[PDB]
């Protein structure tokens, strides 16, 4: 029984240290079917299963004393405790991968399985955390596995996947890194780690990263061998240095014009054609990260100089257009030099807007330019891109009127359906593009339309002369596809509850006009049963249609509340059991770094199916959007992640978002997963979202704060190990009433404590909320928070 592998115990104890080299595979045998060795080991079989890793790397010490291959089976074994492993099985892979760690330096047998284990203690700890320096140091030394160099990283995912774990500035590996800054193998693994890194100038000083940026260049930069790791310092030090050094522009140059000479080097470094024209952002930043921390000529010649810097450069059209804005009139000679000048298209889009969105920036020259390059343009007036974006690009810049016909040419997103917001943008109330419109209502559906049947009503003016006509040809459209299949279906059908809102309501909407809208709620009635009573694959169509229902009242303005009101509340309760059986039915439906991410993905990474139903999950969120049709029907589904999970906390983790006494019962069904999370996962994010929701539940309340004080030990009672959702907990605190008593409609001290210690003075922010409409004594308290402050 539980001595049935005592037998394999005794062939443990026959798979000791030196006859390992026999009986370990006996061990194994009855670790083959892992009766009490990952089985009942569960059990004080742990031992066991411990000994199935434990002895099985006590196994080792004598056989594989030369013998590798015997330490291969150790290899083997503890893989094979850890392939069993129905028991814990994590003793000896903390201590054996421990000893096996840069600690065991390469004998490759050990390293293998150290960062392919990882994943739940990469998910847990790191704890130690200070092997992958040590590791680091090795990967800088001659024992390279990336694996383990992006462990660095996975170790600090270790570090921080459970366990948040930091400190020295992660200097123990960025000295290893340093060690690997200049030469070094698995480098890009090893730089895998320059998260850590890139985090390290926070509780610290950007400012000390700010002026560190130069270091490894000479090495990274010149030495480009290895581009692969390199860019994450380049944000860092485009942020914690550059933007550092924006915020020295708000407050290196030396770390930094150098390194930028650098870059603008390395903006040679691209060759150009499209396909070299591609991460001319990060230049382009880097560009706004140099102008703006007036360089432009060189731009201005880079852009009028033509893929080779064009491609580069007129892609960066941006650069100065976003990282700076109404930028000096250097380019309006580019705004006809370019002008005559793929990337420029694009710089075209870019810049006709940045040009539309220059505002301020000197001359009427481009504005000629504008008018006449542009013009050109306007007069070419044909792309499918720069007549979606470049023209549109100026389009904006009036709102040209040579368009009143291609307003009517508008009929057949971007190319059709952007200018005419722009053109309801040209008019606040020809005129027979309605037809056009109609025609576009022939032509369009498209996706872009959200706003398009409100902003319809727009130019209507409420002048009624399409009104029966485009909406009838709507009605035609919901006829023009007449079947089960319909495309477009009614969801981009459902514009006719928007042109509703738009001409009931922005100009009823919902009841009244549902007439026509009918066939469009059929129409949105069309497919429910489809995919529902198939349960089959290809659902999403449906999660594709919750766009729509995922534009709601959204509060309310003129069709804004109302477009909703006319689809959601005009056509509610039909298919809803309809996608209540699509609920309750699809209801069922750097590495080591990412197990542990997917461990902490365990709900995230869990369901990739009822998108649907996670859609039908939004579709309840909008039906809890509809609250605002048997509701409670959905209530009624709510229990079903409840009654867990993984998928089903993936499905849980929804709730985040969707009766306070049902919520004290959601409350207690998070809380079971509550303790069900280890939760030293970050879902206390979720948590938050729920704490909304929760707040939009906060009697039973009093049980549900009483349920919500469990949290309130939470990481309270940890009083340690988050330093991370801490703050949407005292956001949580507005108006709120051991961890759970004293912050009770106090939260101050904690708040005051978390202050200094988080990411340093993370915490500051909540401070609005005491004061946010305080009281005398309050105000005094506030005042004698001061001193928790001080």
């Given at each position: 029984l539980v001595l049935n592998d005592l037998l394999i115990c005794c062939r443990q104890l026959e798979h000791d240290r030196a006859t390992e080299r026999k009986k370990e595979v006996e061990k194994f045998k009855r670790l083959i079917r892992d009766p009490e060795t990952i089985k009942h080991l569960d059990r004080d079989a742990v031992f066991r299963f411990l000994q199935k890793y434990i002895q099985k790397e006590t196994e080792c010490l004598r056989i594989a004393k030369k013998k590798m291959q015997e330490i291969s089976s150790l290899v083997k074994y503890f893989i094979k405790c850890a392939n069993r492993r129905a028991p814990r099985l994590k003793c000896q892979e903390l201590l054996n991968y421990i000893m096996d760690t840069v600690k065991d330096s390469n004998i490759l047998l050990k390293d293998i399985?150290?960062?392919?284990?990882?994943?739940?203690?990469?998910?847990?700890?790191?704890?130690?955390?200070?092997?992958?320096?040590?590791?680091?140091?090795?990967?800088?030394?001659?024992?390279?596995?990336?694996?383990?160099?992006?462990?660095?990283?996975?170790?600090?995912?270790?570090?921080?996947?459970?366990?948040?774990?930091?400190?020295?500035?992660?200097?123990?590996?960025?000295?290893?890194?340093?060690?690997?800054?200049?030469?070094?193998?698995?480098?890009?693994?090893?730089?895998?780690?320059?998260?850590?890194?890139?985090?390290?100038?926070?509780?610290?000083?950007?400012?000390?990263?700010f002026r560190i940026r130069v270091c490894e260049l000479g090495d990274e930069i010149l030495p480009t061998l290895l581009y692969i790791w390199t860019q994450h310092r380049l944000n860092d030090s485009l942020k914690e240095v550059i933007i550092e050094l924006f915020q020295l522009q708000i407050y290196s140059t030396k770390w930094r014009s150098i390194l930028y000479n650098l870059y603008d080097l390395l903006v040679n470094e691209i060759s150009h054609n499209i396909a070299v024209k591609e991460n001319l952002i990060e230049l382009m930043a880097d560009i706004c990260h140099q102008v703006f921390n007036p360089w432009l000529q060189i731009a201005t010649q880079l852009i009028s100089k033509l893929s080779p810097l064009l491609m580069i450069l007129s892609q960066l059209l941006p650069q100065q257009r976003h990282g700076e804005r109404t930028p000096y009139v250097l380019r309006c000679l580019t705004e006809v030099a370019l002008c005559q000048d793929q990337k420029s298209d694009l710089l075209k889009l870019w810049n006709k807007i940045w040009c539309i969105t220059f505002r301020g920036i000197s001359s009427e020259q481009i504005q000629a330019e504008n008018f006449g390059l542009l013009g050109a343009i306007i007069q070419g007036s044909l792309v499918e891109v720069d007549r979606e974006f470049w023209k549109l690009f100026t389009g904006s810049a009036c709102r040209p009127a040579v368009c009143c016909l291609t307003l009517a040419l508008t009929?057949?997103?971007?190319?059709?359906?952007?200018?005419?917001?722009?053109?309801?943008?040209?008019?606040?109330?020809?005129?027979?593009?309605?037809?056009?419109?109609?025609?576009?209502?022939?032509?369009?559906?498209?996706?872009?339309?959200?706003?398009?049947?409100?902003?319809?009503?727009?130019?209507?003016?409420?002048?009624?002369?399409?009104?029966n006509f485009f909406q009838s040809v709507?009605?035609?459209?919901?006829?023009?596809?007449?079947?089960?299949?319909?495309?477009?279906?009614?969801?981009?059908?459902?514009?006719?509850?928007?042109?509703?809102?738009?001409?009931?309501?922005?100009?009823?909407?919902?009841?009244?006009?549902?007439?026509?809208?009918?066939?469009?709620?059929?129409?949105?009635?069309?497919?429910?049963?489809?995919?529902?009573?198939?349960?089959?694959?290809?659902?999403?169509?449906?999660?594709?249609?919750?766009?729509?229902?995922?534009?709601?009242?959204?509060?309310?303005?003129?069709?804004?509340?109302?477009?909703?009101?006319?689809?959601?509340?005009?056509?509610?309760?039909?298919?809803?059991?309809?996608?209540?059986?699509?609920?309750?039915?699809?209801?069922?439906?750097?590495?080591?770094?990412?197990?542990?991410?997917?461990?902490?993905?365990?709900?995230?990474?869990?369901?990739?199916?009822?998108?649907?139903?996670?859609?039908?999950?939004?579709?309840?969120?909008?039906?809890?959007?509809?609250?605002?049709?048997?509701?409670?029907?959905?209530?009624?589904?709510?229990?079903?992640?409840?009654?867990?999970?993984?998928?089903?906390?993936?499905?849980?983790?929804?709730?985040?978002?969707?009766?306070?006494?049902?919520?004290?019962?959601?409350?207690?069904?998070?809380?079971?997963?509550?303790?069900?999370?280890?939760?030293?996962?970050?879902?206390?994010?979720?948590?938050?979202?729920?704490?909304?929701?929760?707040?939009?539940?906060?009697?039973?309340?009093?049980?549900?704060?009483?349920?919500?004080?469990?949290k309130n030990l939470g990481q309270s009672n940890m009083d340690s190990e988050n330093t991370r959702d801490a703050q949407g907990q005292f956001l949580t605190v507005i108006g709120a009433f051991?961890?759970?008593?004293?912050?009770?409609?106090?939260?101050?001290?904690?708040?005051?404590?978390?202050?200094?210690?988080?990411?340093?003075?993370?915490?500051?922010?909540?401070?609005?909320?005491?004061?946010?409409?305080?009281?005398?004594?309050?105000?005094?308290?506030?005042?004698?928070?001061?001193?928790?402050?001080?």
């Open positions: 399985l150290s960062v392919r284990k990882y994943w739940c203690e990469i998910s847990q700890q790191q704890w130690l955390e200070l092997f992958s320096v040590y590791f680091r140091l090795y990967l800088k030394p001659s024992q390279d596995v990336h694996r383990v160099l992006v462990a660095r990283i996975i170790h600090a995912v270790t570090k921080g996947c459970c366990s948040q774990t930091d400190g020295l500035n992660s200097k123990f590996l960025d000295f290893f890194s340093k060690a690997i800054q200049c030469a070094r193998q698995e480098k890009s693994s090893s730089g895998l780690n320059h998260i850590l890194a890139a985090l390290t100038i926070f509780l610290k000083t950007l400012a000390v990263n009929t057949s997103v971007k190319m059709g359906i952007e200018q005419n917001m722009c053109e309801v943008n040209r008019s606040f109330s020809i005129m027979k593009w309605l037809l056009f419109y109609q025609l576009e209502g022939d032509l369009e559906n498209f996706p872009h339309l959200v706003l398009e049947k409100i902003l319809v009503s727009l130019t209507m003016k409420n002048c009624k002369a399409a009104m709507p009605e035609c459209e919901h006829h023009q596809k007449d079947k089960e299949e319909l495309s477009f279906s009614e969801v981009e059908e459902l514009f006719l509850q928007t042109t509703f809102d738009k001409m009931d309501f922005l100009t009823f909407s919902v009841h009244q006009n549902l007439k026509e809208s009918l066939d469009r709620c059929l129409l949105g009635l069309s497919e429910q049963l489809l995919n529902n009573y198939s349960s089959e694959i290809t659902n999403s169509e449906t999660l594709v249609r919750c766009s729509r229902l995922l534009v709601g009242v959204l509060g309310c303005y003129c069709y804004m509340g109302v477009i909703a009101e006319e689809e959601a509340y005009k056509s509610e309760l039909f298919q809803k059991a309809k996608s209540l059986m699509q609920c309750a039915g699809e209801s069922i439906t750097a590495s080591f770094i990412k197990k542990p991410f997917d461990r902490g993905e365990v709900e995230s990474m869990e369901d990739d199916t009822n998108g649907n139903l996670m859609e039908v999950e939004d579709q309840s969120s909008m039906n809890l959007f509809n609250d605002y049709s048997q509701s409670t029907i959905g209530a009624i589904n709510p229990l079903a992640e409840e009654y867990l999970a993984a998928d089903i906390r993936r499905k849980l983790l929804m709730l985040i978002d969707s009766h306070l006494h049902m919520y004290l019962m959601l409350l207690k069904e998070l809380p079971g997963e509550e303790y069900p999370l280890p939760m030293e996962d970050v879902l206390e994010l979720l948590k938050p979202l729920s704490n909304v929701c929760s707040l939009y539940r906060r009697c039973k309340t009093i049980l549900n704060h009483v349920l919500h004080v469990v051991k961890y759970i008593f004293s912050v009770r409609m106090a939260l101050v001290n904690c708040l005051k404590t978390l202050l200094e210690a988080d990411p340093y003075s993370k915490w500051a922010i909540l401070n609005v909320m005491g004061k946010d409409f305080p009281v005398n004594e309050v105000f005094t308290q506030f005042l004698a928070d001061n001193h928790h402050q001080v």
